């Protein structure tokens, strides 16, 4: 699958996660972007997490749509620097 | 392995994790479902976690039965949206 | 690699992690076993973590020796139930 | 890819992560090395995490550059002890 397509897909995931957390959980755009990366990479520090039922549902959706996409993106990126 | 079979398997994991956490740790059904996804995806925020020995044992079982199943499910889902 | 050999390897990792955490960080055997699974599975709730320099070094060693071993063990287990 | 090259790459990631956390977030060299492993392995206990915008940005960079590199390094190490 073309590396550039995978890039657009992960970017779309990042936008989805970031806007969602910002609007549902009320954290700043910067914190929301950070939380999105920490979540889809499966790091999960837990310094930020959803505190509402809608936020919990949303986070589950992001986990399902985002973890795989991020994993493929990382691996494709490996190919280019390595 | 047929994607729909993997779907049923991950659904069964999700039911197992959610009912187990709800009954053993006493959190709500919604929190327990959320915790199940957060656990089997290996995110592990830690906003929720078991506080009893039985809950700890149970969580180890869920980790072993669930992490692989979820990974395969994510990868199969990748195939279909992509 | 024979599935049973992988089983022995992950059991050895679990023993190493559990005894190490118990003796270095002073948590109970049960908590230490749970923490070991939570760590080598990469869940990392953070309800338990090392608070000493030796514990931090030890945890890095467990991460390096344990995460791959657990990953291979999970995948092999998948094959037998699936 | 030669295992020793992968070794150098992960060592470089570890240096990057450790110095970055130490200087941006102000934690000790030891805590910063520990946090780097905990992050690039995707464990993410959350006992340590960035509390500044620059730290958050930096952590996202380390996640992208480090998680893949660490995964390949673990897998190569598997080959040699096994
Ligand atoms: K993880
Ligand atoms: K994690
Ligand atoms: K975590
Ligand atoms: K955590």
Short mmCIF file of N, CA and C in Angstrom, two decimals, chain A:
data_model
loop_
_atom_site.label_atom_id
_atom_site.label_comp_id
_atom_site.label_asym_id
_atom_site.label_seq_id
_atom_site.Cartn_x
_atom_site.Cartn_y
_atom_site.Cartn_z
N UNK A 1 0.86 -1.18 0.00
CA UNK A 1 0.00 0.00 0.00
C UNK A 1 0.89 1.23 0.00
N UNK A 2 0.61 2.20 -0.89
CA UNK A 2 1.55 3.31 -1.04
C UNK A 2 1.73 4.01 0.29
N UNK A 3 2.99 4.26 0.64
CA UNK A 3 3.33 4.92 1.89
C UNK A 3 2.60 6.25 2.07
N UNK A 4 2.45 7.01 0.99
CA UNK A 4 1.79 8.31 1.11
C UNK A 4 0.31 8.16 1.46
N UNK A 5 -0.34 7.12 0.95
CA UNK A 5 -1.73 6.89 1.34
C UNK A 5 -1.86 6.60 2.84
N UNK A 6 -0.97 5.75 3.35
CA UNK A 6 -0.94 5.43 4.77
C UNK A 6 -0.70 6.70 5.57
N UNK A 7 0.18 7.58 5.08
CA UNK A 7 0.37 8.87 5.76
C UNK A 7 -0.94 9.65 5.87
N UNK A 8 -1.69 9.77 4.77
CA UNK A 8 -2.96 10.52 4.83
C UNK A 8 -3.92 9.87 5.82
N UNK A 9 -3.95 8.54 5.84
CA UNK A 9 -4.86 7.85 6.74
C UNK A 9 -4.52 8.13 8.20
N UNK A 10 -3.23 8.13 8.54
CA UNK A 10 -2.86 8.39 9.94
C UNK A 10 -3.12 9.85 10.30
N UNK A 11 -2.89 10.75 9.34
CA UNK A 11 -3.23 12.15 9.54
C UNK A 11 -4.72 12.31 9.81
N UNK A 12 -5.55 11.60 9.06
CA UNK A 12 -7.00 11.66 9.27
C UNK A 12 -7.36 11.17 10.67
N UNK A 13 -6.73 10.08 11.10
CA UNK A 13 -6.91 9.57 12.47
C UNK A 13 -6.52 10.59 13.54
N UNK A 14 -5.39 11.26 13.33
CA UNK A 14 -4.91 12.26 14.26
C UNK A 14 -5.89 13.42 14.37
N UNK A 15 -6.43 13.88 13.23
CA UNK A 15 -7.40 14.97 13.25
C UNK A 15 -8.67 14.55 13.99
N UNK A 16 -9.18 13.37 13.65
CA UNK A 16 -10.34 12.79 14.35
C UNK A 16 -10.16 12.69 15.87
N UNK A 17 -9.06 12.08 16.30
CA UNK A 17 -8.78 11.94 17.73
C UNK A 17 -8.67 13.29 18.41
N UNK A 18 -7.96 14.21 17.77
CA UNK A 18 -7.66 15.50 18.42
C UNK A 18 -8.91 16.35 18.56
N UNK A 19 -9.64 16.52 17.47
CA UNK A 19 -10.88 17.29 17.52
C UNK A 19 -11.87 16.64 18.50
N UNK A 20 -11.97 15.32 18.45
CA UNK A 20 -12.92 14.63 19.33
C UNK A 20 -12.62 14.86 20.80
N UNK A 21 -11.36 14.69 21.19
CA UNK A 21 -11.03 14.84 22.61
C UNK A 21 -11.24 16.29 23.03
N UNK A 22 -10.82 17.23 22.18
CA UNK A 22 -10.97 18.66 22.48
C UNK A 22 -12.42 19.01 22.72
N UNK A 23 -13.31 18.52 21.85
CA UNK A 23 -14.70 18.95 21.98
C UNK A 23 -15.48 18.17 23.03
N UNK A 24 -15.16 16.90 23.18
CA UNK A 24 -15.91 16.07 24.11
C UNK A 24 -15.40 16.22 25.53
N UNK A 25 -14.08 16.26 25.68
CA UNK A 25 -13.47 16.28 27.02
C UNK A 25 -13.01 17.67 27.44
N UNK A 26 -12.91 18.59 26.47
CA UNK A 26 -12.69 19.99 26.79
C UNK A 26 -11.23 20.38 27.00
N UNK A 27 -10.30 19.49 26.70
CA UNK A 27 -8.89 19.84 26.85
C UNK A 27 -8.44 20.66 25.66
N UNK A 28 -7.31 21.34 25.84
CA UNK A 28 -6.80 22.25 24.80
C UNK A 28 -6.42 21.44 23.55
N UNK A 29 -6.33 22.14 22.43
CA UNK A 29 -5.92 21.52 21.18
C UNK A 29 -4.59 20.80 21.35
N UNK A 30 -3.63 21.45 22.01
CA UNK A 30 -2.31 20.83 22.16
C UNK A 30 -2.37 19.57 23.01
N UNK A 31 -3.02 19.65 24.16
CA UNK A 31 -3.15 18.46 25.00
C UNK A 31 -3.89 17.35 24.24
N UNK A 32 -4.91 17.73 23.47
CA UNK A 32 -5.70 16.74 22.72
C UNK A 32 -4.89 16.05 21.64
N UNK A 33 -4.01 16.79 20.97
CA UNK A 33 -3.12 16.18 19.98
C UNK A 33 -2.16 15.20 20.63
N UNK A 34 -1.59 15.63 21.75
CA UNK A 34 -0.68 14.78 22.52
C UNK A 34 -1.37 13.50 23.01
N UNK A 35 -2.56 13.66 23.57
CA UNK A 35 -3.34 12.52 24.06
C UNK A 35 -3.64 11.55 22.89
N UNK A 36 -3.95 12.12 21.73
CA UNK A 36 -4.24 11.28 20.57
C UNK A 36 -3.03 10.41 20.21
N UNK A 37 -1.84 11.01 20.13
CA UNK A 37 -0.64 10.21 19.84
C UNK A 37 -0.37 9.18 20.94
N UNK A 38 -0.48 9.60 22.20
CA UNK A 38 -0.24 8.70 23.31
C UNK A 38 -1.22 7.53 23.28
N UNK A 39 -2.44 7.77 22.80
CA UNK A 39 -3.46 6.73 22.74
C UNK A 39 -3.26 5.79 21.56
N UNK A 40 -3.12 6.34 20.35
CA UNK A 40 -3.04 5.46 19.17
C UNK A 40 -1.71 4.71 19.08
N UNK A 41 -0.70 5.21 19.80
CA UNK A 41 0.57 4.49 19.87
C UNK A 41 0.53 3.42 20.94
N UNK A 42 -0.55 3.42 21.73
CA UNK A 42 -0.77 2.47 22.85
C UNK A 42 0.12 2.72 24.07
N UNK A 43 0.69 3.92 24.15
CA UNK A 43 1.48 4.30 25.33
C UNK A 43 0.58 4.46 26.58
N UNK A 44 -0.45 5.31 26.47
CA UNK A 44 -1.47 5.41 27.53
C UNK A 44 -0.99 5.81 28.92
N UNK A 45 -0.27 6.93 29.00
CA UNK A 45 0.22 7.41 30.30
C UNK A 45 -0.92 7.56 31.30
N UNK A 46 -2.05 8.08 30.83
CA UNK A 46 -3.17 8.27 31.72
C UNK A 46 -3.18 9.62 32.44
N UNK A 47 -2.25 10.49 32.08
CA UNK A 47 -2.27 11.85 32.57
C UNK A 47 -3.49 12.61 32.03
N UNK A 48 -3.93 12.19 30.86
CA UNK A 48 -5.22 12.59 30.28
C UNK A 48 -6.01 11.36 29.86
N UNK A 49 -7.32 11.40 30.11
CA UNK A 49 -8.20 10.29 29.74
C UNK A 49 -9.62 10.84 29.77
N UNK A 50 -10.56 10.19 29.08
CA UNK A 50 -11.94 10.69 29.12
C UNK A 50 -12.64 10.51 30.46
N UNK A 51 -13.42 11.52 30.85
CA UNK A 51 -14.17 11.42 32.09
C UNK A 51 -15.68 11.45 31.90
N UNK A 52 -16.13 11.36 30.65
CA UNK A 52 -17.55 11.30 30.36
C UNK A 52 -17.87 10.02 29.59
N UNK A 53 -19.12 9.55 29.67
CA UNK A 53 -19.51 8.36 28.89
C UNK A 53 -19.28 8.53 27.38
N UNK A 54 -19.61 9.70 26.84
CA UNK A 54 -19.38 9.95 25.42
C UNK A 54 -17.89 9.91 25.12
N UNK A 55 -17.07 10.46 26.02
CA UNK A 55 -15.63 10.44 25.82
C UNK A 55 -15.09 9.02 25.85
N UNK A 56 -15.64 8.19 26.73
CA UNK A 56 -15.21 6.80 26.81
C UNK A 56 -15.57 6.05 25.53
N UNK A 57 -16.80 6.25 25.05
CA UNK A 57 -17.22 5.65 23.78
C UNK A 57 -16.33 6.09 22.62
N UNK A 58 -16.11 7.40 22.53
CA UNK A 58 -15.25 7.96 21.50
C UNK A 58 -13.85 7.36 21.56
N UNK A 59 -13.33 7.19 22.77
CA UNK A 59 -11.96 6.70 22.93
C UNK A 59 -11.87 5.28 22.42
N UNK A 60 -12.92 4.49 22.69
CA UNK A 60 -12.96 3.13 22.14
C UNK A 60 -12.95 3.14 20.61
N UNK A 61 -13.68 4.08 20.00
CA UNK A 61 -13.69 4.17 18.55
C UNK A 61 -12.31 4.54 18.01
N UNK A 62 -11.64 5.48 18.68
CA UNK A 62 -10.32 5.91 18.27
C UNK A 62 -9.32 4.77 18.41
N UNK A 63 -9.45 3.99 19.48
CA UNK A 63 -8.57 2.83 19.71
C UNK A 63 -8.71 1.85 18.53
N UNK A 64 -9.94 1.55 18.15
CA UNK A 64 -10.18 0.60 17.05
C UNK A 64 -9.73 1.12 15.68
N UNK A 65 -9.98 2.39 15.40
CA UNK A 65 -9.68 2.95 14.09
C UNK A 65 -8.22 3.38 14.00
N UNK A 66 -7.62 3.68 15.14
CA UNK A 66 -6.32 4.34 15.13
C UNK A 66 -5.08 3.52 15.40
N UNK A 67 -5.21 2.49 16.25
CA UNK A 67 -4.03 1.73 16.65
C UNK A 67 -3.42 0.97 15.47
N UNK A 68 -4.26 0.38 14.64
CA UNK A 68 -3.78 -0.36 13.49
C UNK A 68 -3.16 0.58 12.48
N UNK A 69 -3.83 1.70 12.25
CA UNK A 69 -3.38 2.68 11.27
C UNK A 69 -2.02 3.23 11.68
N UNK A 70 -1.88 3.54 12.96
CA UNK A 70 -0.61 4.07 13.45
C UNK A 70 0.48 3.02 13.32
N UNK A 71 0.14 1.77 13.63
CA UNK A 71 1.15 0.71 13.53
C UNK A 71 1.67 0.56 12.10
N UNK A 72 0.77 0.57 11.12
CA UNK A 72 1.19 0.46 9.74
C UNK A 72 2.03 1.68 9.34
N UNK A 73 1.65 2.86 9.85
CA UNK A 73 2.35 4.09 9.49
C UNK A 73 3.79 4.08 10.01
N UNK A 74 3.95 3.65 11.26
CA UNK A 74 5.26 3.54 11.87
C UNK A 74 6.16 2.61 11.06
N UNK A 75 5.60 1.48 10.64
CA UNK A 75 6.37 0.46 9.94
C UNK A 75 6.80 0.97 8.56
N UNK A 76 5.89 1.64 7.86
CA UNK A 76 6.22 2.25 6.58
C UNK A 76 7.30 3.32 6.75
N UNK A 77 7.18 4.11 7.81
CA UNK A 77 8.18 5.13 8.12
C UNK A 77 9.55 4.52 8.38
N UNK A 78 9.56 3.38 9.08
CA UNK A 78 10.80 2.62 9.29
C UNK A 78 11.51 2.39 7.96
N UNK A 79 10.74 2.00 6.94
CA UNK A 79 11.32 1.68 5.64
C UNK A 79 12.15 2.83 5.06
N UNK A 80 11.70 4.06 5.29
CA UNK A 80 12.29 5.22 4.64
C UNK A 80 13.53 5.79 5.31
N UNK A 81 13.48 5.94 6.63
CA UNK A 81 14.67 6.34 7.37
C UNK A 81 15.67 5.18 7.45
N UNK A 82 15.16 3.95 7.52
CA UNK A 82 16.04 2.77 7.51
C UNK A 82 16.20 2.22 6.10
#
